[PDB]
RNA sequence: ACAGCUGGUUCCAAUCGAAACAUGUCGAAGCAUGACCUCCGCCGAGGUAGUCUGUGAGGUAGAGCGACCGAUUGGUCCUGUCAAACUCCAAACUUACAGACGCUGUUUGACGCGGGGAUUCCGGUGCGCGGGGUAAGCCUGUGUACCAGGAGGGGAACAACCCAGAGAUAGGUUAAGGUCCCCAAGUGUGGAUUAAGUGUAAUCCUCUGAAGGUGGUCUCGAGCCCUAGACAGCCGGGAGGUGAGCUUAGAAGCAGCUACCCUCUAAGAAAAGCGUAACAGCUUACCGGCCGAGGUUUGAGGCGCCCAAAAUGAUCGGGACUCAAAUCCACCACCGAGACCUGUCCGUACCACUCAUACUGGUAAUCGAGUAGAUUGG
RNA sequence: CUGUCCCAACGUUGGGCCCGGUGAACUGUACAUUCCAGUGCGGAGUCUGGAGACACCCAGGGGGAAGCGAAGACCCUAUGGA
RNA sequence: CGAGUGGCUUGCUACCUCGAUGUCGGUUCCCUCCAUCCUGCCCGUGCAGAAGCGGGCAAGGGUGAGGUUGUUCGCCUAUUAAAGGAGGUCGUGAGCUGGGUUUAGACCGUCGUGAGACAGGUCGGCUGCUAUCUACUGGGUGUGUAGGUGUCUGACAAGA
RNA sequence: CGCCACACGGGGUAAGAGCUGAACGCAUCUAAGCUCGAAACCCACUUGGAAAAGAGACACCGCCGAGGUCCCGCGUACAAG
């Protein structure tokens, strides 16, 4: 389904939390925002305790529930949520106008944000968002 | 630094990205070759593996680099030969190459067949009771030639009692 | 030290709910193999009886001999596959495209559904093929119903609509298939899908018991000895610690038992035939009387007499097919006596 | 019992025995080890060990380090070898122990301990240039067996 | 009925503002008398919370002991250790009196004296110094500041940790703390380290992490070797007198004992390590070649790693962060209290005028928080 | 000797459940949809951080409200009683 | 000898509750921990084999029936792959039991002049409440998404 | 107390076994890279699941009528619903 954004994001290689900082910012500035491409984000360290962490997030829960995405369509979308004021109404207005997708679905090509990109020639501990989310046990859909 | 290795006559060695192809007459190996602010490039007759920094970290990849690209010069022309020999006291072992994998029958008297799946185009030969693995990729070989080794593995009964398999017998 | 114990029943049938559909639904199907063909099929659950028959498993000391079975009969006439579905890869999943229907309906299939009037079963199958080029066609199943009609034991006339999945060749071939089942009439049979001693699973909604205490819903100990006297008969000890200060959902309670969906796996057809030779003298309690096209299933089938029971190809056979078992004799005595 | 109780020097100077009765025997049976008729400049390498933290250590741990220590020196250069140990400091400080709760808690004397400060030398060993790396490894078993962590230093020896 | 025991005791405001300690008590869940709080009257010029100097008092820290005393080593003077109830020594510091400066007092009367009224005599915590105890969110002292009876800002929350002591209202600037988002302010600058998500945890019942170990990595120093070719690797040589002598059936580098000598030479042990019954065989020493640039030994520092096991769901407050949003060295700009500055107003105190304690004018940097309680106007 | 147990089943009668009529009491500082951790006078639905959470109703067995009921009968204390 | 981890034992303290937070053991039902008894995969061996001994990863599952004793603990028997340990207010009395501790009756031994006592033994000796909130197991009614019928998808969730 | 059904296999790892390989010409399972490898983890399989607030998809029927409720005879259902 549509959804006009006036910033669309290309998550592309970028330090996820980066790019999850600044689309918070802007979504509270009244910005709609579109990460795209979140399969492709990526998220810096050693895999092994980077998975152990978010393996720990899904096995964790109880009869209130702790509903943790294993897609890495939800898990950037958890990423704004904890930088957002969820539960109050602007907050949640916010996190309401900002919405994160598999690939790219617009025509467009996406802006990538200052300081949020990665060189891979110069890194080689780190781990792409669907590389977390193929070991949590999602289904490749991408 | 900077390391620069002349290609021989033989071989031509063209390179996209991180990963490098060198082509010969023996064949043709693509290798990936990627570690942080290392840039490895082909400079017309040469291959160049350089860093801005000379931290020894970064000098143990340079050096693991250099003798990767020497290897795969190595097994596009002269190639690369592991030799095997196959040692049995009581059991006779049947040693045969059906299809892609190399199967080991009756071992040690058993009923059901020891198999492992040969890596890449490396070619296993065999005369009688000496095995030759042999190919371009010294990965691809070394492997293969291990994994045969390895097949025999016991760890239930004293292998100085029961020293059936094939071993290696010649290492290039 | 107090004794260990595994807990009383399992966590993954839950929750132990009514079901929404009394018609099963899979939630798993075959893999794609040889020929194409239709992936299931389904029934009307008659009662049961036993069959004399011949050993055929080649390991078994007996082979050969006259063996004793217990088989659930299950009239299975002809069902009519009135279109085909398809469904495109998207990134969420597989969500459905466009349907094929047809022109000849049964005359009361309107009990149920909205018959079409007015469609075109050529724009749709276009919709298909120019999914299939693009590289985006997810599986091809065909929505199916049953003639309740064909059963006379069976008061209802309002058929029951199923989805099923086509599998076996290529993704070009098996819609052609699909596409040729489906413009005839939609007519098939259970000899299309299977044959005579094939692995089955069969799913149903089981018999309702309305709402039961948690020894018959759960199998927990009745109250012993003096216990048993003191005011509290079917009731567990507690209904947990001090902490966590909460009723744990794991905990045995009260509720809904029966009228659940169950796939049992792993069913053997014993034989596939017409005719009345597995009827019952005096016909079948609380069912009737057997005289059409039949299954007969190895041992217990879910659900009671008159339910919709669903067969699909084995999705994890532990045996290997040993078809047409020897039928010596099949009982006919009454089922009351 | 462990050093945990009596590691620290939190409790004033006990060391008084004209006031204090019923105090244990020490358990280090030496002092002066090795060749004790021949001078500490008639050699030409003299290594100590250097306790790092201020410390209280029991003659049992005195007797347990010096025992470990010598008797790899007795292995290696022989029971009447070319060399002098020194175990400078002595058990002074009275131990006691609270073994009726929290009432009448001034406890009875169960032993005896040493205040070695930081940056001491608790044993210093003078051997020859050949025997250097012998006692270096006598030392190594000795602060195993005290409570805190040490330093194997040399003070006269160019000889490297 | 009596109770030293529990509960309750009803309107507003203004000034001051404790004690949880000492002596006695069939006293310790209570009283009395002091300390301390408050109120009134008297007196009439000094006072002394700080500092400096002068004239005195002191034996704690430290230190030391052929300076006493008592502990406490060994050797044929020398050599090894200690003290709450030791001292030939000896602080910091505390303390008497005086002078000087400071501050304060003579309409706000200080210092002091007399009288009325109390409350209070379960305290707590931080820090410094303690004594007991394995320890304790332990017990019991002492000095001090605080909570109690202290708001507001910060610390995730949180009596006593940090800033801060506070009339109302208003503008401004800071403090502690903070500036990637949640969240006001930097995805700030120069440089370096860390790859463990170490860390993002001042203090702490609360934030663990130890002895021991670490060619993980970074940095600094020292000695020695090297283009007359070092370190390593690979090739070649590793030879004869003689298989040394003694011992022994034998022992021939290599069971043991002793010696450990000289030729050839560019080296080559009377043999460093395996091996054999003994030989043989494999190499070590040592020498030469190929190769070509630094190498090797030791010391110190920085960050990290191992050591590292617990019970419903993991955590730096959370998200999450890696040339940082970590750590260390510097630096730049900001955000951020009721603090500080500033306009107006209020109360209280004092001054001038006054019968007034009614107006009016003036002063307060040196007035404005408060439980028990004293005092006063409504 | 046997359902005390293995190991539970089916049945019988009265309730229970729905409908008409009759119609109490216990209890109630307030707020209250909670859960996991933490913190706090060290045993929190209410503080902190997160997680979860559309409202109302029916039946249930009683995990929690350190549930309700009784100014602890134990223990100590009182210049108490018997 | 030295360094620690845990918070099952015991001891210490006296912070919390004396206008009451129901005491042991057992039972029943649920969750968890790993310092692993078995089971899977491994390393060493004084590893021929077989059977073992020791060690590593690992908490998915399992770890049972009985004789004395109120017992926890423990001793004992026969089975077993093994018949591991521990936390959840020493989980669990608005669930059960009430054999032990610990009222009022009584006896014995010891002590006491005596009343009477005992960290001695012994026989007997009671178990309240109609669920407001919350929690969970199942069942409905509404509203939201915004005419209807039928078929599905799958974010998440549970499993041994 | 009777009867029927309840895998294999993939994928990634731990301990471990190795390959190629440098720092450190050699050596080295590791530092980059790679082949394997647990009843454990993920998938496979079963059950729930449009209230998933991004509140979903498809096909047909219908908006003056499709469909639903009440009603009636009953259970493959059921404490009311
Ligand atoms: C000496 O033991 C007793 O006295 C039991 C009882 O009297 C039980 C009272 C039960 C009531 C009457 C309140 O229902 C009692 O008041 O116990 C207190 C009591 O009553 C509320 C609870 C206490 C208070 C702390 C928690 N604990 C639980 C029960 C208990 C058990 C004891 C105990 C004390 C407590 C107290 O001594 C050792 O065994
Ligand atoms: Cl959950
Ligand atoms: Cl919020
Ligand atoms: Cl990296
Ligand atoms: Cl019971
Ligand atoms: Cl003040
Ligand atoms: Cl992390
Ligand atoms: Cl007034
Ligand atoms: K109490
Ligand atoms: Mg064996
Ligand atoms: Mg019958
Ligand atoms: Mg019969
Ligand atoms: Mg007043
Ligand atoms: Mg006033
Ligand atoms: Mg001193
Ligand atoms: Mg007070
Ligand atoms: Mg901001
Ligand atoms: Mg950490
Ligand atoms: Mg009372
Ligand atoms: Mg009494
Ligand atoms: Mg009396
Ligand atoms: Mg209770
Ligand atoms: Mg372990
Ligand atoms: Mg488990
Ligand atoms: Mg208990
Ligand atoms: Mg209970
Ligand atoms: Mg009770
Ligand atoms: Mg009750
Ligand atoms: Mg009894
Ligand atoms: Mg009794
Ligand atoms: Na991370
Ligand atoms: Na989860
Ligand atoms: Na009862
Ligand atoms: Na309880
Ligand atoms: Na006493
Ligand atoms: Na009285
Ligand atoms: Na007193
Ligand atoms: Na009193
Ligand atoms: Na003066
Ligand atoms: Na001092
Ligand atoms: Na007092
Ligand atoms: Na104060
Ligand atoms: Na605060
Ligand atoms: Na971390
Ligand atoms: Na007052
Ligand atoms: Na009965
Ligand atoms: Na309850
Ligand atoms: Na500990
Ligand atoms: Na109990
Ligand atoms: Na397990
Ligand atoms: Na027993
Ligand atoms: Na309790
Ligand atoms: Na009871
Ligand atoms: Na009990
Ligand atoms: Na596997
Ligand atoms: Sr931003
Ligand atoms: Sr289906
Ligand atoms: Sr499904
Ligand atoms: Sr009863
Ligand atoms: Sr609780
Ligand atoms: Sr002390
Ligand atoms: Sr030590
Ligand atoms: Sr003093
Ligand atoms: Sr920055
Ligand atoms: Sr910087
Ligand atoms: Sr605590
Ligand atoms: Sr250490
Ligand atoms: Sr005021
Ligand atoms: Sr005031
Ligand atoms: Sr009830
Ligand atoms: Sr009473
Ligand atoms: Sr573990
Ligand atoms: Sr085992
Ligand atoms: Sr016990
Ligand atoms: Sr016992
Ligand atoms: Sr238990
Ligand atoms: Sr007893
Ligand atoms: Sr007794
Ligand atoms: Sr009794
Ligand atoms: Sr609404
Ligand atoms: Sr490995
Ligand atoms: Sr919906």
């Not at chain 4, 009596?6 to 409790?11: F, V």
Request: charged share 30%; glycine share 10%.
């Amino acid at each position: 389904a549509e959804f006009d954004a006036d910033v669309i994001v290309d998550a592309r290689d970028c330090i996820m939390g980066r790019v999850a900082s600044q689309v918070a910012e802007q979504a509270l500035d009244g910005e709609t925002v579109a990460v795209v491409n979140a399969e492709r984000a990526v998220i810096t360290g050693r895999e092994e305790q980077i998975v152990e962490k978010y393996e720990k997030r899904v096995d964790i829960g109880n009869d209130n529930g702790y509903f943790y995405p294993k897609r890495p369509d939800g898990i950037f979308k958890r990423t704004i949520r904890g930088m957002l004021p969820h539960k109050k109404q602007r907050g949640r207005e916010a996190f309401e106008s900002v919405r994160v997708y598999l690939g790219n679905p617009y025509d467009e090509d996406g802006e990538v944000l200052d300081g949020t990109s990665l060189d891979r020639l110069s890194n080689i501990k780190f781990v792409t968002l669907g590389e977390i989310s193929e070991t949590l046990g999602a289904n490749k859909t991408w | 630094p900077r390391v620069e290795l002349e290609i021989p006559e033989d071989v031509d060695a063209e390179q996209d990205h991180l990963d490098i192809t060198v082509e010969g007459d023996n064949g043709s190996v693509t290798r990936r070759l990627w570690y942080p602010d290392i840039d490895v490039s082909v400079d017309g007759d040469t291959v160049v593996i350089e860093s801005d920094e000379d931290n020894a970290k970064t000098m143990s990849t340079i050096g693991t680099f250099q003798s990767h690209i020497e290897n795969m010069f190595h097994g596009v022309t002269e190639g690369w030969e592991y030799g095997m020999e196959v040692f049995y006291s009581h059991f006779p072992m049947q040693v045969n190459v059906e299809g892609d994998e190399v199967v080991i029958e009756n071992f040690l008297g058993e009923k059901a067949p020891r198999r492992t799946t040969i890596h890449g185009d490396t070619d296993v030969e065999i005369d009688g009771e000496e095995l030759t693995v042999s190919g371009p990729d010294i990965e691809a070989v070394g492997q293969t030639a291990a994994d045969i080794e390895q097949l025999t593995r016991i760890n239930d009964k004293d292998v100085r009692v029961f020293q059936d398999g094939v071993y290696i017998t010649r290492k290039p | 030290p107090q004794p260990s114990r595994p807990r009383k029943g399992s966590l993954g049938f839950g929750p132990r709910k009514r079901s929404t559909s009394e018609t099963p639904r899979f939630n798993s199907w075959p893999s794609d193999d040889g020929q194409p063909g239709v992936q299931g099929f389904a029934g009307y659950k008659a009662g049961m009886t036993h069959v004399v028959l011949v050993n055929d498993e080649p390991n078994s000391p007996r082979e050969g001999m006259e063996e004793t079975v217990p088989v659930t009969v299950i009239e299975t006439p002809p069902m009519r596959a009135v279109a085909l579905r398809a469904y495109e890869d998207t990134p969420y999943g597989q969500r459905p495209l466009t349907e094929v229907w047809t022109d000849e309906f049964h005359s009361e299939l309107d009990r149920t559904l909205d018959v079409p009037e007015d469609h075109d079963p050529d724009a749709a199958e276009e919709q298909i093929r120019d999914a299939h080029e693009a590289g985006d066609l997810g599986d091809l199943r065909l929505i199916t119903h049953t003639v309740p009609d064909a059963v006379p034991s069976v008061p209802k006339k309002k058929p029951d609509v199923m989805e099923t999945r086509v599998g076996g060749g290529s993704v070009s071939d098996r819609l052609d298939h699909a596409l040729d089942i489906v413009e005839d009439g939609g007519e098939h049979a259970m000899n299309d899908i299977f044959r005579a001693g094939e692995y089955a699973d069969v799913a149903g909604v089981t018999k309702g018991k309305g709402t039961q205490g948690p020894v018959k819903r759960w199998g927990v100990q009745k109250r012993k000895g003096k216990h048993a006297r003191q005011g509290w008969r079917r009731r567990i000890g507690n209904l947990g610690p001090w902490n966590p200060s909460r009723v744990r959902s794991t905990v045995p309670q009260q509720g809904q038992t029966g009228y659940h969906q169950r796939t049992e796996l792993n069913k053997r057809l014993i034989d596939i035939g017409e005719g009345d030779e597995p009827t019952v003298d005096g016909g079948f309690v609380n069912y009737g009387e057997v005289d059409g096209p039949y299954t007969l299933v190895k041992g217990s089938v879910p659900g009671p007499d008159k339910r919709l029971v669903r067969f699909r190809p084995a999705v994890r056979p532990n045996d290997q097919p040993r078809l047409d078992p020897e039928v010596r004799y099949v009982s006919n005595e009454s089922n009351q006596g | 019992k462990p050093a945990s109780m009596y590691r620290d020097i939190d409790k004033p100077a006990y060391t008084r025995r004209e006031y204090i009765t019923g105090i244990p025997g020490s358990k280090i049976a030496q002092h002066k080890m090795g060749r004790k008729q021949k001078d500490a400049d008639d050699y030409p390498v003299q290594i100590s060990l250097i306790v790092e933290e201020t410390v209280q250590l029991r003659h049992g741990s005195l007797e347990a380090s010096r025992l470990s220590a010598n008797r790899h020196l007795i292995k290696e250069l022989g029971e009447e070898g070319d060399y002098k140990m020194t175990l400078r400091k002595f058990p002074h400080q009275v131990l006691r122990e609270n073994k009726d709760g929290m009432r009448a808690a001034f406890g009875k004397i169960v032993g005896t301990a040493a205040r070695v400060q930081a940056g001491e030398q608790l044993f210093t060993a003078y051997c020859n240039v050949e025997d250097a790396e012998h006692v270096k490894e006598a030392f190594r078993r000795a602060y195993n067996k005290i409570t805190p962590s040490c330093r194997i230093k040399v003070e006269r020896g160019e000889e490297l």
